[PDB]
């Protein structure tokens, strides 16, 4: 339980997410989806 495993919803977050406001300060999703 005490050991490292990262963050599952942050792997998803790195895939097609919008770090900025949806969809204005940032207009489309990032990083790893193929455009």
From Swiss-Prot:
Coiled-coil annotated spans: none
Subcellular location: Virion membrane; Host membrane; Host Golgi apparatus, Host trans-Golgi network
Region listing for Disordered, in residue ranges: 1-25
Virion surface compartment spans: 1-32
Subunit-level organization: Interacts (via N-terminus) with gM (via N-terminus). The gM-gN heterodimer forms the gCII complex.
Functional note: Envelope glycoprotein necessary for proper maturation of gM and modulation of its membrane fusion activity. Also plays a critical role in virion morphogenesis.
Family membership: Belongs to the herpesviridae glycoprotein N family.
Protein name in UniProt: Envelope glycoprotein N
Region of the whole protein represented: 24 to 58 of 91
